Amino acid sequence: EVQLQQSGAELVKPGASVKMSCKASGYTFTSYWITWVKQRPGQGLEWIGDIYPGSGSTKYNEKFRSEATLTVDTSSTTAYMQLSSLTSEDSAVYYCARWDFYGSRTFDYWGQGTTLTVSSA
Amino acid sequence: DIVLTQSPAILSVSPGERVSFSCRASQNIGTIIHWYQQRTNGSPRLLIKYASESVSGIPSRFSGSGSGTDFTLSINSVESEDIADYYCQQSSSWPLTFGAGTKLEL
Amino acid sequence: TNLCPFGEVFNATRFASVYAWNRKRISNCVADYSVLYNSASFSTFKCYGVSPTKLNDLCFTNVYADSFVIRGDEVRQIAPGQTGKIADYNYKLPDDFTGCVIAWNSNNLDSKVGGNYNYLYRLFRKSNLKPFERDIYFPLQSYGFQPTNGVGYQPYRVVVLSFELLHAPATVCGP
Ligand SMILES: *[C@@H]1O[C@H](CO[C@@H]2O[C@@H](C)[C@@H](O)[C@@H](O)[C@@H]2O)[C@@H](O[C@@H]2O[C@H](CO)[C@@H](O[C@@H]3O[C@H](CO)[C@@H](O)[C@H](O)[C@@H]3O)[C@H](O)[C@H]2NC(C)=O)[C@H](O)[C@H]1NC(C)=O
User: Which pairs of positions does the record mark as disulfide bonds (chain C)?
Assistant: First the structure.
């Protein structure tokens, strides 16, 4: 069945980049876009950016044009978001999502919730 | 960029009451709006597709209405099984924008 | 005095199908044409009856964006006075209008493996269309947009900016 599963949880000191991944399964990967969303303890969801698995096009939220870069391995059907650097404000919970661009345009399937502890100590 | 104002941030309510929400876009969206619910500790999930008609799989108690710019959601009655936050979202044009989110509480 | 919603029209997730091309009314906005012109994505920015660099200095009374997806070869038809199946039966531009046609290759987005068929054009009609109207064998043919189609077959997203230059009250102005 279609479901997305997050890589897990990561802990790093500031400056130490994280490259994280959501594991896709259960549907034709090229057919439905992949979309990344972000949230933090105490406030609602915010969009990061999109990538098209079948052609590798990407889109970004302007606030994160630099920190985030999106890529896909369409053979094994898994998408990746790379973050260059981290601040203690960036301590946040991240969700990977399915976006159905050619049909409903809904984020109808989500990950289990990635946690990023940015910590200086 | 469309900014999606949603409030009241806390909708204090007694169970059994009918509840209503509302999304006001900062431009004409057409009708490409969705709503999502987040129970405690939980992920968000899709409830209403194109802002008016329930997605195939969600209970019929959830109904959407409105069009053009003013989008609204009402739940016929809230029990503690439905205690959650609800977020507005739009997908008409880039960049995609989520709402601030509203809180149900006793 | 506030900025003008060009982004929404240009960066719309899905365009309209030509046979029922969309039309948005742009008003009460200080349109910044420089950002559109300098952008290199647009293969063809052909302005009829106005100079593309001059655009940023004028003011206009009503301006409309018409947006729709077509195949690469038919874009030549969008030039005024060119007669063809897409022009005659789908979208025909008034003789000697004053506007600018902008196009760009959208095969990055609209093309789908296994074909995307959401886009339709009218295959049969009894008589040619009058300027700037839309009509709604079986008369609608789907385009077979496959990601590896030829350049002519690749989908081009076309926005036609139509604006009247006569000095009636002008609500859309440039810097
Ligand atoms: C259609 O959208 C493009 C891209 O817009 C950008 O990407 C989206 C996915 C969203 O994240 C948008 O919020 C975001 O703006 C528009 O082209 C873009 O225009 C902006 C101007 O606001 C450019 O921003 C840059 O900003 C930095 C820092 O200020 C400067 O150094 C740059 O010189 C530039 O100003 C951005 O580079 C540009 N992107 C591209 C690929 O050209 C486009 O304008 C829009 N359509 C219309 C009609 O506006």
Answer: 4-29, 47-100, 59-173
CB distance A59 to ligand 1 below 6 Å: yes
Other beta carbons less than 10 A from residue C137's beta carbon = 6
User: C23: Cβ–Cβ under 8 A, 6 or more apart, which residues?
Assistant: C64, C65, C66
Give the integer Cα–Cα distance in Å for A33 and A35.
7
Cis preceding-peptide flag for C5 (omega within 30 of 0): no
The answer to whether residues C50 and C87 belong to one domain is yes
Give me ligand 1 centre to Cα C133, in Å: 33
What is the C-alpha to C-alpha distance for residues A108 and A99, in angstroms, rounded to an integer?
A: 7
Q: Which residues of A27-62 are buried (b: 16+ CB within 10 A; e: fewer)?
A: eebbebbbbbbbbeeeebbbbbbbbbbbbeeebbbe
Same structural domain for residues C79 and C162? yes
Q: What residues contact residue B19 under an 8 Å CB cut-off, 6+ apart?
A: B11, B13, B74, B75, B77, B78, B104
Instruction: Report the amino acid identity of residue C110.
Output: D
State the residue range of the domain holding A107: 3-118
The total domain count for chain A is: 1
- Expt. technique: cryo-EM
Residue C153 φ/ψ, nearest 5 degrees: -75, -20
Q: Nearest 5°: CA angle at A98, between A96 and A100?
A: 155
Question: Resolution, rounded to a tenth of an Å?
Answer: 3.1
C-beta C36 within 6 A of ligand 1: yes
Residues C16 and C76 occupy one common structural domain: yes
The range of the structural domain enclosing residue C58 comes to 1-114+147-175
Ligand 1 atom closest to the CA of C6, numbered from 1 = 48
Residues of C in contact with A52 (CB under 8 A): 108-109
What CATH number is associated with residue A37?
2.60.40.10
Which chain C residues are closer than 8 Å to B1 by Cβ? 7
CATH pick for B4-104 out of 3.40.50.10710, 3.40.50.2300, 3.40.50.2000, 2.60.40.10: 2.60.40.10
Please tell me whether residues C130 and C108 are part of one structural domain: no
